[PDB]
Design a protein around this nucleic acid. Structure first.
Lengths: 159, 312, 117, 177, 248, 60
RNA sequence: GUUUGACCUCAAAUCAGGUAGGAGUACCCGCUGAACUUAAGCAUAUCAAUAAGCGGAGGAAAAGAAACCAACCGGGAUUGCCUUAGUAACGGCGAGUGAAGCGGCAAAAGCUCAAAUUUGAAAUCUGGUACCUUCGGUGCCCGAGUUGUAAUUUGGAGAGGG
RNA sequence: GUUCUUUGUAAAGUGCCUUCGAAGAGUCGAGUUGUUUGGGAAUGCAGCUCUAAGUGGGUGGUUCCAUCUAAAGCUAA
RNA sequence: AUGGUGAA
């Protein structure tokens, strides 16, 4: 028997919505260690001989995400269900519901790791966005709130 | 001796890469010579197949993830194994190399006349046609020919590369029906072995006897015929065969394949002029026609068999 | 600042020359990697070299044409229990020489002599 | 960040959420060995506030002990004998049964070069810290030795044998008092 | 098997570009041929060449008959071809991807050439590329033993050349290459004699390198082939010679 | 001659064989090196620069 | 896609690099713990928070920067000596047991984490390898690491800016 | 003492003004069974049961006042 | 009494 705050997970986001979430999220990769290093050597070769705006990426640290929700800066928050200590993330759907930040439980922790240059991530969030994907993001917010939140209003109940 | 099932377990490499390595040294079961496999396990090519396998796990986790940016990095920072240090163990003396180059050109002249498939990469093929015309560049330059033999199979050749009568069957220029039986894994690895072998020899024939290796090519002659008249060459007799066709300017015509036949006349010394080049001083025209038409007095009209009769 | 500090360090290293810029590394790889197999390297089994044909050809003396019964008998027999790899034919002209259909196999069987034997 | 939420979540131990985690893990830890290595600490907030950094050289052994000398110190002593190259830093409670108690004792490799460098943890490399648990120099050992500050700890502050030897051996000067 | 709803709209909206794309071109060259210029985009024939820094030399097209080799490509993504492009690709019998044919470019040929531009790649080949194509790939639909003709098999012989064509002076396979490289009168007969050229595809596999080499080469098509979608779109020419090294 | 030849082939590379390393003792083959012991935390290096142990005298 | 690919977990090897055992033991730190003997027989008091045994360290160890002592015109980490003192206090008030704060002195030194985001860029480290001025430095590659490694802060506050 | 190099919109310090400002739980404590002491306000510890708070909590002084900040760690003489 | 050595 599962106490309602556990198994608020497993009632995860479905097939098509999850695919569309990654269609958005895979656009916003953090610049990998190799890519970042080569860019700075390009900067070294250029600026030593002879401007840029703030670049948007996903935010992916548990401490960083728990900061961003309640900041409030997070817009979408993805949460993996499979976590070795489950108690690490059990409060997080409640925190998002309380602060009114739209969240989604995604399926697979390594699935979050792929979009983020890590092995696993447990939580991923998209704070800010480029102007072109703004309408698409807000549409996905409504899509997730209709599919995830409104269908499973009774997820806080039932063992 | 040891067992064929033992050595793969012993070497702990791929069985194909066992077969791929076994071509490289030239090891044959008399059963497997046990010292020789123990001789094999300390060899730098064995370093690479383990590394080429562990490249492949590290790459498919890359594209599997979806970071193609990181996936692309793996290739540019990826070595190739050379087969230089399979050669000097195997070909101690260069005159021993030229008595095994018999089979080498016998493979590699086949592969130029091949359609590119999924099984065979065209880069190999476009090297093979390049290496053939690199081979024929030196042979036609310093006139090094002795004997010819056109037959049903292909066209044999014979030449004293510092006196050893090499013999290399050029097949006929046609589409070749690739049979389902054959294996282009074993044969390609021979080509892979033979290709690098053929580089050093052509370096050797140029940079010690003749010219610079490799000479540049001429593109616009390659647009016409793509054979031996292109691929121009720059540095930096005793036989009557080498004295044949000395200032005997020929015209060749569209009946014969010029590629098989411009080679010999340039190996002798006569000049070759084709019908095909557009797409007088000549005094011969080779024709295979029941109906000949022009028939000038200056040109001497000989069917090309007699040219092969001139060589033998 | 962080990236701005990090650049300044990579500026510092190229000021000290510990590090090459990536455009010259291509130039280090342009001069390199074309110069491959372009060097001198020289300065026991007899490998069973193939039998040299002379005068068995496209235009032979035509008694070398197989008897019409042995044509099928060569066909009805299977491979390697077999004397010729072909049946020779007669061609007066150079032009009439066919597509020599089995030259691919002749190397593939030869290749198996090279290491399995 | 989350460590405040975890800190407060670990307070309500018999509450529905954490009660369920206990009954699953108590079964799971009985399946495994007596002394075995966990890859990550189950209560990571507690691991941190007892001095664990998630870098190479830190090891979290999970240990099982019988119920009814102190059990925390016995838990540390058992891992000390098994993992002799390591040095015991601190231990903490994770889960308990009617018959057994479980502790997730945290260890440091003094031999590993990632610890021999950084000055925040290179003190453990000094040979004066070989088997801290076998001398009661851990948190629970210092607790059972009655070593604090106050009127309560007068007879056992700076070594209970040291104060006994001081009080029950005669002292005489050159020019007698 | 099941169809996702993503597919049927993407297929709808892409073809209903091409249904709109060729409609405009079919209206235009109508007004170019019938010569009713009161409102047109452009008044002449455009052929652009894209080679290598990535040069785009746009040219005119005179009436001079030239020789074009055309390879079938499989583009774009979701495009069921309409009726108007089923036909031209069937009349050139380019219904298989990675299959080629030589045709002649006239001012009768050029207007229909703007129809099939997104579905193939075109270009002028060289004589080597003429020759090394035919003597390395060549099909002959000719009679088998007695019954089974459609074994297309191989340009094995020069006397099969005597058999079907023959009486047009067509005596050897090298003589065919004279009839293609030079615009001969029996060019269409020998063009009707060598029906496809089954070129190989470049990537030709799944795998470690093969997934990557597919991705690295697929973007290379996106530069060396642009899809103009214009009323007076140019016809884009690529170098065939470098392409056939990739395809032979 | 064997030992000097082995030292020449292991010329200044990390982890040369155990039979060529300095004997010293066991405890001194453990225990932090000069660099490792003198290795100080980044904060303390700043506090050393900002406020070093000054030299002074006390009278006039 | 009845393939394939991410991870997590369990493996492996005569692989690479390490490390732990044993001796010594006066001192120190833990654990365990008698009896002869003292008040009258002996359950405590008493031998004794001993001896033996067990485990673990070092040149010292342990202790230590207050969840301290105090009741004053307050002291101010710890350790030791002198004194407080054979005092308070306990003890079939009996064999007797036996401190501590203050004061004088010896020596004096303080600090590091965990704690709210680097988020305009994991800024960190291991290892392999190539060189170099080798108790190490640098380039390159690899791994760890966002289930958090660096910088900044530890209440004496501190941080954000001006 | 003698030099060789010091850099980067780098690293701090100080005073004023302005806006914020999180400090350790199967632990504290409670009952009991033993051990520890000469310990009278079971001192200290362990075992077992239950198990907190944040203008908080621990310790002392005649109705308040004083005093520190546990449940993490390092350190010479 | 503690710890050990031997043993029809």
């Amino acid at each position: 028997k599962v106490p309602p705050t556990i198994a608020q997970f497993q009632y995860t986001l479905d097939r098509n919505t999850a695919a569309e979430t990654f269609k958005l999220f895979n656009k916003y990769r953090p610049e990998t260690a190799a890519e970042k290093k080569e860019r700075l050597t390009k900067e070294a070769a250029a600026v030593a001989e002879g401007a840029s705006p703030k670049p948007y990426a996903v935010k992916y640290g548990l401490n960083h995400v728990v900061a961003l929700i309640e900041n409030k800066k997070a817009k979408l928050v993805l949460i993996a269900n499979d976590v070795d200590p489950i108690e690490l993330v059990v409060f997080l759907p409640a925190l998002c519901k309380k602060m009114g930040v739209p969240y989604a439980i995604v399926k697979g922790k390594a699935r979050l790791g792929t979009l983020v240059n890590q092995k696993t991530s447990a939580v991923a969030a998209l704070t800010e966005v480029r102007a072109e994907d703004e309408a698409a993001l807000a549409k996905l917010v409504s899509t997730i709130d209709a599919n995830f939140a409104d269908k499973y209003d009774e997820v806080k109940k039932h063992w | 001796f040891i067992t064929r099932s033992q050595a793969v377990r012993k070497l702990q490499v791929s069985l194909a890469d066992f077969r791929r390595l076994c071509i490289f040294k030239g090891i044959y079961p008399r059963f497997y010579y046990a010292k020789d496999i123990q001789y094999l396990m300390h060899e730098p090519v064995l370093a690479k197949f383990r590394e080429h396998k562990t490249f492949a796990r590290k790459l498919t986790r890359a594209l599997g993830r979806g970071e193609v940016s990181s996936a692309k990095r793996l290739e540019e920072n990826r070595d190739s194994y050379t087969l230089d240090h399979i050669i000097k163990e195997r070909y101690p003396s260069f005159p021993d190399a030229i008595r095994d180059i018999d089979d080498a050109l016998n493979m590699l002249f086949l592969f130029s006349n091949l359609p590119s498939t999924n099984q065979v990469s065209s880069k190999i093929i476009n090297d093979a046609q390049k290496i053939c015309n690199q081979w024929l560049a030196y042979v036609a330059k310093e006139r090094l020919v002795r004997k010819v033999f056109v037959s049903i199979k292909g066209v044999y050749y014979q030449a004293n590369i510092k006196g050893e009568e090499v013999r290399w069957l050029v097949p006929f220029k046609f589409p070749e029906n690739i049979p389902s039986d054959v294996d282009f894994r074993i044969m390609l690895t021979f080509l892979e072995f033979y290709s690098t072998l053929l580089h050093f020899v052509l370096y050797k024939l140029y940079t010690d006897s003749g010219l610079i290796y490799p000479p540049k090519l001429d593109l616009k002659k390659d647009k016409i015929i793509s054979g031996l008249s292109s691929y121009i060459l720059e540095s930096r007799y005793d036989s009557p065969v080498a004295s044949l066709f000395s200032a005997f300017v020929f015209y060749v015509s569209r009946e014969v394949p010029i590629d098989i036949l411009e080679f010999l006349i340039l190996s002798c010394g006569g000049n070759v002029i084709s019908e095909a080049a557009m797409d007088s001083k000549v005094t011969h025209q080779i024709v295979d026609r029941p109906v000949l038409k022009n028939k000038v007095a200056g040109r001497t009209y000989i069917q090309p068999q007699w040219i092969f009769d001139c060589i033998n | 600042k962080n990236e701005a500090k990090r650049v300044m360090k990579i500026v510092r290293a190229i000021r000290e020359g510990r590090i090459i810029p990536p455009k010259k590394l291509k130039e280090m790889k342009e001069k390199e990697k074309i110069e491959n197999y372009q060097y001198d390297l020289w300065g026991l089994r007899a490998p069973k070299l193939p039998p040299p044909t002379n005068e068995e050809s496209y235009n032979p003396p035509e008694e070398y044409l197989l008897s019409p019964e042995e044509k099928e008998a060569w066909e009805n027999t299977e491979y390697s229990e077999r004397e010729r790899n072909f049946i020779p034919q007669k061609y007066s002209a150079l032009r009439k020489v066919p597509g020599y259909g089995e030259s691919i196999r002749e190397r593939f069987e030869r290749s198996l002599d090279l290491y399995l034997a | 960040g989350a460590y405040k939420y975890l800190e407060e979540l670990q307070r309500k131990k018999q509450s529905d959420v954490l009660r369920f985690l206990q009954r699953v893990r108590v079964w799971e830890y009985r399946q495994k060995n007596v002394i075995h290595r966990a890859a990550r600490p189950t209560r990571p907030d507690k691991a941190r506030r007892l001095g664990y950094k998630a870098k190479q050289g830190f090891v979290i052994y999970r240990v099982r002990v019988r119920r009814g000398r102190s059990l925390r110190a016995t838990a540390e002593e058992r891992v000390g004998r098994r993992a002799a190259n390591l040095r015991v830093l601190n231990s903490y409670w994770v889960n308990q049964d009617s018959t057994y108690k479980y502790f997730e004792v945290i260890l440091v490799d003094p031999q590993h070069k990632a610890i021999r460098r950084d000055a925040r943890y290179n003190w453990i490399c000094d040979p004066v810290h070989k088997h801290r648990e076998a001398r009661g120099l851990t948190a629970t050992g210092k607790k059972s030795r009655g070593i604090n500050k106050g009127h309560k700890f007068n007879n056992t502050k700076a070594g209970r044998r040291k104060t006994w030897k001081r009080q029950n051996t005669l002292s005489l000067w050159r020019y007698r008092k | 098997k099941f169809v996702r709803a993503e597919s049927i709209v993407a297929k709808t909206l892409a073809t209903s570009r091409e249904k709109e794309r060729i409609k405009r071109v079919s209206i235009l060259e109508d007004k170019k041929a019938k010569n009713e210029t009161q409102h047109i985009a452009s008044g002449k024939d455009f052929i652009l060449k894209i080679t290598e820094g990535l040069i785009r030399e746009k040219t005119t097209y005179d009436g001079k008959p030239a020789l074009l080799f055309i390879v079938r490509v499989r583009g774009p993504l979701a495009v069921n071809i309409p009726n108007k492009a089923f036909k031209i690709l069937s009349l050139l019998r380019l219904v298989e991807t990675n299959t080629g044919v030589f045709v002649k470019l006239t001012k009768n040929v050029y207007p229909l050439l703007k129809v099939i531009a997104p579905y193939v790649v075109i270009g002028k080949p060289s004589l080597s590329s003429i020759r090394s194509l035919i003597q390395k790939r060549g099909r002959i639909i000719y009679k088998g033993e007695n019954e089974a003709e459609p074994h297309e098999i191989v340009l094995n012989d020069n006397n099969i050349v005597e058999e079907q064509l023959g009486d047009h002076g067509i005596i050897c396979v090298e003589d065919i290459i004279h009839e293609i490289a030079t615009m001969g009168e029996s060019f269409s007969v020998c063009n009707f004699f060598l029906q496809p050229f089954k070129l190989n595809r470049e990537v030709s596999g799944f795998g470690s390198l093969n997934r990557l080499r597919k991705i690295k080469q697929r973007e290379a098509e996106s530069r060396t082939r642009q899809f103009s979608n214009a009323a007076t779109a140019p016809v884009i020419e690529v170098d065939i010679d470098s392409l056939l090294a990739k395809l032979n | 001659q064997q030992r000097e030849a082995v030292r020449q082939l292991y010329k200044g590379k990390k982890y040369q064989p155990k039979d060529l390393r300095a004997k010293k003792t066991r405890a001194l083959r453990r225990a932090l090196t000069k660099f490792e012991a003198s290795q100080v935390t980044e904060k303390q290096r700043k506090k050393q620069i900002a406020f070093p142990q000054r030299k002074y005298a006390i009278k006039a």
